[PDB]
Ligand binder design. Sequence first.
Ligand code: MG
Ligand code: MG
Ligand code: MG
Ligand code: MG
Ligand code: MG
Ligand code: MG
Ligand code: MG
Ligand code: MG
Ligand code: MG
Ligand code: MG
Ligand code: MG
Ligand code: MG
Ligand code: MG
Ligand code: MG
Ligand code: MG
Ligand code: MG
Ligand code: MG
Ligand code: MG
Ligand code: MG
Ligand code: MG
Ligand code: MG
Ligand code: MG
Ligand code: MG
Ligand code: MG
Ligand code: MG
Ligand code: MG
Ligand code: MG
Ligand code: MG
Ligand code: MG
Ligand code: MG
Ligand code: MG
Ligand code: MG
Ligand code: MG
Ligand code: MG
Ligand code: MG
Ligand code: ZN
Lengths: 47, 95, 68, 62
Amino acid sequence: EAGAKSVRNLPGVHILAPDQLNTYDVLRADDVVFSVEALNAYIAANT
Amino acid sequence: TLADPRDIILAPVISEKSYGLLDDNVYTFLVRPDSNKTQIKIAVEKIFAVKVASVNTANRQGKRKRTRTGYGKRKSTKRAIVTLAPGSRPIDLFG
Amino acid sequence: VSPGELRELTDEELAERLRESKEELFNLRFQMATGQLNNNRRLRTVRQEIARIYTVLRERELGLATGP
Amino acid sequence: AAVCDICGKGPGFGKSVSHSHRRTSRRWDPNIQTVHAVTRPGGNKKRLNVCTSCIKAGKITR
RNA sequence: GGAGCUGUCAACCGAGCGUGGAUCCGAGGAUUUCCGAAUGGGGAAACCCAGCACGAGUGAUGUCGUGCUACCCGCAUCUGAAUAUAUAGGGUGCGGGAGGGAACGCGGGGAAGUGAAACAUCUCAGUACCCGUAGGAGGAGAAAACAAUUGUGAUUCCGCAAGUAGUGGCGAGCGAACGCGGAACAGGCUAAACCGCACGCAUGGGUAACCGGGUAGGGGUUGUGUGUGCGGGGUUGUGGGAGGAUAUGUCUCAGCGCUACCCGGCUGAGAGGCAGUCAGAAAGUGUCGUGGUUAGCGGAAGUGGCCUGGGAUGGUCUGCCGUAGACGGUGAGAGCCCGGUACGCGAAAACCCGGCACCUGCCUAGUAUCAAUUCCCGAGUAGCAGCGGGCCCGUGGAAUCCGCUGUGAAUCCGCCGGGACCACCCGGUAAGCCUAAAUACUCCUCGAUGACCGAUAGCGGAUUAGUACCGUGAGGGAAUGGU
Ligand SMILES: [Mg+2]
Ligand SMILES: [Mg+2]
Ligand SMILES: [Mg+2]
Ligand SMILES: [Mg+2]
Ligand SMILES: [Mg+2]
Ligand SMILES: [Mg+2]
Ligand SMILES: [Mg+2]
Ligand SMILES: [Mg+2]
Ligand SMILES: [Mg+2]
Ligand SMILES: [Mg+2]
Ligand SMILES: [Mg+2]
Ligand SMILES: [Mg+2]
Ligand SMILES: [Mg+2]
Ligand SMILES: [Mg+2]
Ligand SMILES: [Mg+2]
Ligand SMILES: [Mg+2]
Ligand SMILES: [Mg+2]
Ligand SMILES: [Mg+2]
Ligand SMILES: [Mg+2]
Ligand SMILES: [Mg+2]
Ligand SMILES: [Mg+2]
Ligand SMILES: [Mg+2]
Ligand SMILES: [Mg+2]
Ligand SMILES: [Mg+2]
Ligand SMILES: [Mg+2]
Ligand SMILES: [Mg+2]
Ligand SMILES: [Mg+2]
Ligand SMILES: [Mg+2]
Ligand SMILES: [Mg+2]
Ligand SMILES: [Mg+2]
Ligand SMILES: [Mg+2]
Ligand SMILES: [Mg+2]
Ligand SMILES: [Mg+2]
Ligand SMILES: [Mg+2]
Ligand SMILES: [Mg+2]
Ligand SMILES: [Zn+2]
């Protein structure tokens, strides 16, 4: 929650959780930034 | 909670009929509309220190006046016309 | 008249401050009818101080802040 | 009457079925019989409306 | 709370108040005419007239102010008519009820139009409407349960089973349950046998018992049986309980059951353990919370240049904030001008929730084995029959469940259910009561949302709106926003 609060009110930055990835939010964004704790927790859930 | 004879008598009537009765020592008061002639006679003999011969009362309905938000009825009064004793002190109603 | 200065009056000075303040309203109701009252804010003032005296006399027979 | 003054038993409502199976409303009223009951022996009587199932038991005396 | 204010259609004025804290916001208190369940008696609701007690006023009747006085039910007392026991009724003092509310709940009453291409059975539909009566939810509920040879183990609710089994002038249509997956979990008191004590009825006087049992006497009639109450004992399905028999066992003191002794029980206090606002008993006084609600306040960063214009929030170059780029206002698209937002601070008093005391209550004698003779396990009930209601089941071979009428059992070697019924086997112990949670609803209070409406739309109602107007009445019911 230290970095979640840091990028709330930037225009264009949308924040979601690893278990809340969905097609409408990936395709709206030109760039997808994973936290390294969040990218491993997405790969280890889909093997 | 105690009473007062000045709670019955509200105000005097100021009109060119009531000025014509001041010459004969006859006074016109607006009284509270739930008061009989004996309350009014005990009160005038205790407020002004005078002797009262007779009290004549007259209810009057309120006027109803046209207004753009509808009709509206005014307040309903009770006059009481007080005749003093033959030869007592006149009441100074301050004008 | 402040409420703080009506509380040192004992038990029957309030009954004769109530009595000489209903005469003050009575003389002011005659001056409004005859049109000889310039200060018309004094009708509102005397009605409040009659109302303020009944509050002090009622508290003393309800057991709230008694004392001469 | 149709209401017992001890057990509170009232009428039940049902139907009345004909041969063409047409159904109309009627009442099963209870067998209410009047009694002049006493409380203590030799006492004064009192008119009550009781049913026959409470005279068959010992709910009242006479 | 912090400098203006005396609400608003809706101004024009008049006269005043405020840094000695006003107006305004919140909490508690006082006042609270008259009608209305309306309740002193009356009435055409908002009016009319009193009685009694205590005060005020008058020379004295007049007059006045504050209290109290309906009816019914319940409890506690006094009186006890015809009439004797007595009751009905009456007097007195305490408590309670009545009426209203948008939906939701439970019990009871109960249509029709319509569908059947007509219609009567059936449907619509146990719907509309109606009556009784609640609670913050209610009802239900601790197996007379299902199941079928292994088993599940209170109820309610949602999804399946399933538009299936079936049921139907086998027409139109209607329609389960077994069982499986979940939400949520909780279990507790009484009646009876018998044992003490209190009151009433009947019987008995050395017939006899009883005086806690045994052991000696004494007393010399308060026993024996039964009825109504209050305690103890008892709460079960693998049947349990009372009553026996044998071992085993009792925290202190006082009192008590004719006297002594051995033993045991009862009452009161103390000590110790437990439980508590609860379904399992119930009220209250204190004190303390990192607590909650009913006002609030603080809160970062541009007077930036030039162009356009009445106006910059616009364009165009620049400077910053962001745990704040939600929304709105401001002379046109504003994070940086304002009210605020993110994020933190704030409660005298009242109320709610919780903790600790105070207080209140329960427990401190039984436990274990054997015996299987007796006693008990909820009565005008179950069952049976007659007529009906409802179950998928429309009277059918019709079980289970419920109503009225009639007949009318048994206490465990009992009784009820397992879809007529019988035998066997399995399952459970009806005719007493209470029980949180999951579920249903929003007149009303705060806080957000909309590929919702934007004045013939959205509520009938942005405007005198249930207003004007129409109707005797119940009811009907508009139109009108923008400098
Ligand atoms: Mg008053
Ligand atoms: Mg005359
Ligand atoms: Mg007249
Ligand atoms: Mg005119
Ligand atoms: Mg009757
Ligand atoms: Mg019926
Ligand atoms: Mg029909
Ligand atoms: Mg019967
Ligand atoms: Mg205030
Ligand atoms: Mg207030
Ligand atoms: Mg009345
Ligand atoms: Mg009446
Ligand atoms: Mg008698
Ligand atoms: Mg009610
Ligand atoms: Mg029909
Ligand atoms: Mg028809
Ligand atoms: Mg038809
Ligand atoms: Mg047709
Ligand atoms: Mg309940
Ligand atoms: Mg289940
Ligand atoms: Mg008992
Ligand atoms: Mg502020
Ligand atoms: Mg600011
Ligand atoms: Mg704007
Ligand atoms: Mg904005
Ligand atoms: Mg049937
Ligand atoms: Mg069978
Ligand atoms: Mg039983
Ligand atoms: Mg039972
Ligand atoms: Mg119940
Ligand atoms: Mg519930
Ligand atoms: Mg709202
Ligand atoms: Mg409209
Ligand atoms: Mg338009
Ligand atoms: Mg009319
Ligand atoms: Zn009966």
